Amino acid sequence: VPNKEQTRTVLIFCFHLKKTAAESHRMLVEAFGEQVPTVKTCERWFQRFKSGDFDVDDKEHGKPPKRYEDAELQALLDEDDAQTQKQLAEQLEVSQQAVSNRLREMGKIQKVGRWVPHELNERQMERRKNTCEILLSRYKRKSFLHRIVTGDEKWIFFVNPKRKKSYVDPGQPATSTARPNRFGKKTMLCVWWDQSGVIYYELLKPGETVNAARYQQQLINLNRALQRKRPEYQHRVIFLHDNAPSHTARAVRDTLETLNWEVLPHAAYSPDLAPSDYHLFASMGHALAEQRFDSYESVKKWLDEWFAAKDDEFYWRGIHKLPERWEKCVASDGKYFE
Template sequence: MSNFVSNKEQLRTALIFCFHLEKIAAESYQLFQETYGERVPLQDTCEQWFRRFKSGDFDVTDKKHGKPPKKYEDSELQALLYEDDAQTQKQLAKQLSLLKPGETINAKRYQQQLIDLGRLLLSKRPEYQQRQHKVILFHDNAPSHKTKLVHDTLEALKWEVLPHAAYSPDLALFDYHLFASMGHALAEQRFCSYEDVKK
């Protein structure tokens, strides 16, 4: 007997040969055992392949199973994983400057984020450098947003900050519904001057 060792696909191709000879799965299994000894698929496996052949599927390669391919919405994360997909979450978080679990944004970190955003904005949108368009920032009343450090940074960047409405106790919940209804009613109207609004 030769040193030939058959692989899965070769055995499956041989099963196709037996199928075309109109052998049944049990006969094919018997022939395989006589020819190859113990290195053959189980009889149940032969029967599964014969069912596939009867349905017209003669593809002897293994079907892809498991998880669907990974999709990333973040191109920076995708680039890091493309470099080395064996990185841990901690390594990726450090490279992407993400917060650690339980860590909060303080004034210093928020200031740095604003500075980084300002740089990116100037590099990607040069029209902001000529001040043809100004940046209008709307952020909430979080303590880190209200510090002098952040206020000075926003002034240096020459960004306008929209005031965030306080949580007013004089507005009841039904007032919010009233304002929404009024907004819908006024949606189609255009006002050219302050006097038009007063009317």
């Protein structure tokens, strides 16, 4: 019993025995029986053998012509990056499943885009670009991160749920989780740190506020802590903090200039330029997930142990990111680079 590939094989053999198409065909018919290609099909193959080959495959058969070739659909994404298949479909005369396939065929894949801090304003942009521009220049004259003490303030929710993902067979419930309350128990952490470590931090008790007055207390307390912790700030201290309604007030301005600290220029709506946000907290967020301290002091034991178990260089890295981190902001002409 034979096959149309195996058949071709035999004929390669029958050929290499110096045998004619005819005396080859009648072999086949006697070995296998009457259902076996035509003499004409043997003669056919013979001609191909005298050129020489293993015709492992047929050459590609006939096929429908493409209704839209690649470079066309590619030009649609070049217009607008993120349209839906249903929707490039309409522009291409073709169905949806149709579009899915070629997208799969091309190198393409869908990814969920990034969240950006806030909708920036054409001024607000020139304003960032500049600060970045200025600070960066002033950097290269003489590095000053070595001096720089920075700080911010972030909420610590008491329970931090996040949706659980389950490995299950298609069409089954994946493990579901109950919503986090928006108006739930939460403290408020404010921490100041420098390139070496964490200098001093307060944990404002549940339902707590930071007012022009409050901040000064902290500021002065920070310095109190600073004296003994960084033994000898020869080199004047450089203070980087967000333009909160509180920090921006004239009351505090006075309390700052009297400590004589330098305030580093800062841009509105720019947490992506502020070490505490994009590096220190960013770490913490991973570390806080699925966690729930039920007591205010459990938060403190956690914070205390967290900072203590942090590496030393981890902070350095954070702070030292700043320069090229600006070089980026300016390369965007005051955009959010991501």
